[PDB]
Design a protein around this nucleic acid. Structure first.
Ligand SMILES: [Mg+2]
Ligand SMILES: [Mg+2]
Ligand SMILES: [Mg+2]
Ligand SMILES: [Mg+2]
Ligand SMILES: [Mg+2]
Ligand SMILES: [Mg+2]
Ligand SMILES: [Mg+2]
Ligand SMILES: [Mg+2]
Ligand SMILES: [Mg+2]
Ligand SMILES: [Mg+2]
Ligand SMILES: [Mg+2]
Ligand SMILES: [Mg+2]
Lengths: 51, 100, 267, 117, 88, 55
RNA sequence: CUUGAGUCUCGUAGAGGGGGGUAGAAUUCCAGGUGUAGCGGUGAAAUGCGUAGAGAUCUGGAGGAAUACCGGUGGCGAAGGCGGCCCCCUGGACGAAGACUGACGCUCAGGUGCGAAAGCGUGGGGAGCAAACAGGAUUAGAUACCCUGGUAGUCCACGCCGUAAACGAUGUCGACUUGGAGGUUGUGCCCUUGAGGCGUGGCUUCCGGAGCUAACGCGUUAAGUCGACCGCCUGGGGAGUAC
RNA sequence: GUUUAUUAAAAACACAGCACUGUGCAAACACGAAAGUGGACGUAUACGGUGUGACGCCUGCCCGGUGCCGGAAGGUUAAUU
């Protein structure tokens, strides 16, 4: 994550790095961990991705 | 014997010792019934991160073949040598030569 | 336990418990460099710091500092030295010399062993702190450059430096927290003495305690005179310090030389 | 009265609150803002349009120098990662580089169990 | 596992012929080596169980072969158990 | 691919965060994906490549 | 005798195991700089921390635990389980030309050994988390959920305990029996001109036919058709309790 | 095992074990106007002081009072000028 542009303007480019980390792997932590809850829900949400 | 590949990076302000360091190691390997079928001096160059401070270090490769025994002797002289910042030596994976 | 070799444990026969013995140091009987040793705890008149008695002693033995330098020693044999549980080894130099040393861990059978500036960094001999890396495990250092005091209590006793400290002063004794010490000093660098050597229980007073010191226990014992607390029907209530020492921590050692050590927490 | 000219601005974007401090180049406090200190408190803050009025308050305390340009350091998620940078772009300040300095470990410490209703 | 200069070595010492890597006399003996050699390994680590499972395998597997010899040529059995210092 | 010196053919399988690109958007025969990632790890120690990006 | 089983050769993939190193991100803490009246938390709040200067911010240091991304419907393991990079010691699985042994095999009461987590003993260690415990809140009450703290413990060594919805709730071994789409790994071959195309083995997902099934559903990795050996069940409660 | 020599031998003292606390070595502490000595020719697995008294299962709530430990910003405050 590193922005930098010539010609002063508040365009953005910022939500570009907002696709690899950002508020995601953040809230991923936030509360508790997972342990068995993930290996399971991670292997059930996978079922979803079929149709 | 078993092949190898060690790339040691010596402190940036101690480059002049790099050439001398090579002769010792190399000589040992040869005096250990081993072989040296690869070598190259990368010199100084910027780092991804200020590993062990600074932002540059001297790089060198190897890719020997000497018996593990004598090379295990290297980890010691390597650790107890503030010159070298980081040490990293992989296994054989068959003789490597040229290119790099 | 957790290492080799484990420590025997006498079995219930006549109120018996943990003992103490090594793997072996083959022989049962010393060299010659030793004195006669004093006797009791008393100070040209009065007792002083009560407790202290029991027989069985002698055997002084020696060596520390290690003035001698780059001359190859060879461990003659490990050996057991009284009062202090830190073994001792023997060692002979390449010129028939024979100091003693504080038996480090991996030792026994001959081994390297070298002193003086610039010497193999294993557990051979002393070495100026300067000529030492991080010394996560040095040894019986010296508050001064020449001496050899410090932690001679080898038995598991260690000391950690801090990789590369400047100003010429470092070290980290056990509970001694942090404390700087002249870097022109040297450390054995080995730093050991076998811990289990101090992992058994005396047993049952007498043949285990008495053979060292007297009943170091007095408790209240009552009799408002013999100690700053006594009498009562059968209990204590109040303060119980001998000579208003105030056993409530207090702490001591104030002003004067030294006291230029650092960190030191309080939990 | 030092005239730092240019200095990065940290945006501690959190949930229960957000605060932006217009520090100098090296990283010295020159002026900090705060939603909790921006009139509304309790929890009415948080919301982006609430933090913007906060960080904007800096242009009233850190304006004593003359920041002609400055970067932005966004840390942690929450309603104040965008709002802040925006309000700053209107306040009159410039910009040199936007970046997210949110502490994203590698499975180091074990987060709190917490919440379970 | 085992080194070729050793495996291909021993085979030419118990084989009643040449390159008979099958022969019980051979295979069986070939097992003792990797076994005795590992005993020094298991002396260290200890906790390494997943490796002992294989150790026990070749052990019983070796025995399964010894019983065979006894049930195919009494002589060969007692004639091999010595050259390997077996039975203990 | 099995190395780290070939830093040239690696900066493509990363990004502004130096994060190992998934195999989803690569379909690198899988077997190769495994090797490709192994390099980026060990290669980062030789400071040849970066771990994070903020430092 | 050779197709079962096994040996040899040469390759292949792997978070299989034991030991030792080492790296980077983050947390906490200690110190110091900047700076100033809030921070933290909740549905709100309050306890708590702040003018003895917090929070924020930046520099240096100490320490412990776990290894983002790759990571998958993935892989390895007998099971339990096993994720950073490096080295050392080590086990098993699979393919292929082959060469070799020659039924040396399958199962297995008793027996031996391995066993998540919690727990136990001795000694270490202790950042984060967190039974107990203590405050604040909620409520009719709240010995809870929520909030601020926090001890054992979680980590290491070595020894013990042997349980789990220890689950595929489906014993191990072998032979048969329509198909479709996919994953992962080996090998042969094809203007190998290619991402690639055609086969032939291992392991593995999802759909599903015959059949089986009380139904759900299982369906070549069977719960279908058979054979060998072992464990087990015989109404609910009382009770996996008493002795 | 020890104890009231000469009315008390005990459930009392001690004990091994446990815990708290202090001590960085010219150690803490003690004898001593001091020099010096003991602690120790030991050096934190060491030495002292306090309490409990093998071992087994354990050792709950209270820091208001007194004591001790840390802080020491602000109030009060000695000699001294
Ligand atoms: Mg009395
Ligand atoms: Mg009386
Ligand atoms: Mg009195
Ligand atoms: Mg809680
Ligand atoms: Mg399997
Ligand atoms: Mg456990
Ligand atoms: Mg424990
Ligand atoms: Mg089906
Ligand atoms: Mg008696
Ligand atoms: Mg009497
Ligand atoms: Mg009497
Ligand atoms: Mg009592």
């Amino acid at each position: 994550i590193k922005v930098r542009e010539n010609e002063p303007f508040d365009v953005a480019l910022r939500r570009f790095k907002r696709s690899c980390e950002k508020a995601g792997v953040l809230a991923e932590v936030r509360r508790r961990e997972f342990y068995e809850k993930p290996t399971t829900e991670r292997k059930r949400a996978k079922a979803s991705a079929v149709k | 014997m078993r092949h190898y590949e060690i790339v040691f990076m010596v402190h940036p302000d101690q480059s002049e010792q790099v050439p001398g360091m090579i002769e010792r190691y190399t000589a040992a390997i040869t005096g250990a019934e081993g072989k040296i079928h690869r070598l190259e001096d990368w010199g100084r160059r910027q780092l991804a991160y200020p590993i062990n401070k600074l932002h540059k270090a001297h790089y060198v490769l190897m890719n020997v073949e000497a018996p593990q025994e004598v090379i295990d002797e290297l980890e010691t002289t390597f650790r107890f040598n503030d010159a070298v910042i980081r040490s990293m030596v992989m296994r054989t994976k068959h003789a490597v030569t040229e290119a790099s | 336990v957790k290492c080799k070799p484990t420590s025997p444990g006498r079995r219930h026969v006549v109120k018996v418990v943990n003992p103490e013995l090594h793997k072996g140091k083959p022989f049962a009987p010393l060299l010659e460099k030793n004195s006669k040793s004093g006797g009791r705890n008393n100070n040209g008149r009065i007792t002083t710091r009560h407790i202290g008695g029991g027989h069985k002693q002698a055997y002084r033995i020696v060596d520390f500092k290690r003035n001698k330098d780059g001359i190859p020693a060879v461990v003659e044999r490990l050996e057991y030295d009284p009062n202090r549980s830190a073994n001792i080894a023997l060692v002979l130099y390449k010129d028939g010399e024979r100091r003693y040393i504080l038996a480090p861990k991996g030792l026994k059978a001959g081994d390297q062993i070298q002193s003086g500036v610039d010497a193999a960094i294993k557990p051979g001999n002393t070495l100026p702190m300067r000529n030492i890396p991080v010394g996560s495990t040095v040894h019986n250092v010296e508050m001064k450059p020449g001496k050899g005091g410090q932690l001679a209590r080898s038995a598991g006793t260690y000391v950690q430096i801090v990789a590369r400290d400047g100003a010429y002063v470092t070290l980290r004794l056990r509970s001694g927290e942090m404390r700087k010490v002249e870097a022109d000093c040297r450390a054995t660098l080995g730093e050991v003495g076998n811990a289990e050597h101090m992992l058994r229980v005396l047993g049952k007073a007498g043949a285990a305690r008495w053979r060292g010191v007297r009943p170091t226990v007095r408790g209240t014992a009552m009799n408002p005179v013999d100690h700053p607390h006594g009498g009562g029907e059968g209990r204590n209530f109040g303060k119980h310090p001998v000579t208003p020492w105030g056993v409530q921590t207090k702490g001591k050692k104030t002003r004067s030389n030294k006291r230029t050590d650092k960190f030191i927490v309080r939990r | 009265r030092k005239q730092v000219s240019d200095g990065v601005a940290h945006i501690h974007a959190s949930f229960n609150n957000t605060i932006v401090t217009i520090t100098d180049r090296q990283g010295n406090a020159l002026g900090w803002a705060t939603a909790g200190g921006s009139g509304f408190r309790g929890s009415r803050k948080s919301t982006p349009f609430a933090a913007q009025v906060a960080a904007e308050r800096c242009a009233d305390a850190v304006k004593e120098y003359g920041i002609k340009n400055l970067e932005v350091m966004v840390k942690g998620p929450g309603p104040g990662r965008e709002s802040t940078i925006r309000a700053l772009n209107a306040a009159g300040f410039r910009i040199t580089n936007i970046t997210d300095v949110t502490p994203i470990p590698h499975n180091g410490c074990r987060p709190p169990k917490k919440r379970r209703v | 596992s085992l080194s070729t200069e050793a495996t291909a070595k021993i085979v030419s010492e118990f084989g009643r012929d040449a390159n008979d890597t099958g022969s019980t006399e051979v295979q069986v003996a070939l097992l003792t080596a990797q076994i005795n050699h590992l005993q020094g390994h298991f002396a260290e680590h200890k906790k390494d169980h997943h490796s002992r499972r294989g150790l026990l395998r070749m052990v019983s597997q070796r025995r399964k072969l010894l019983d065979y010899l006894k049930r195919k040529d009494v002589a060969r059995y007692t004639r091999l158990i010595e050259r390997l210092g077996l039975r203990r | 691919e099995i190395d780290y010196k070939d830093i040239a053919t690696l900066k493509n399988y990363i990004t502004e965060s130096g994060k190992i690109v998934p195999s989803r958007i690569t379909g690198t025969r899988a077997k190769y994906q495994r090797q490709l990632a192994r390099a980026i790890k060990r290669a980062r120690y030789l400071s040849l490549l970066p771990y994070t990006d903020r430092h």
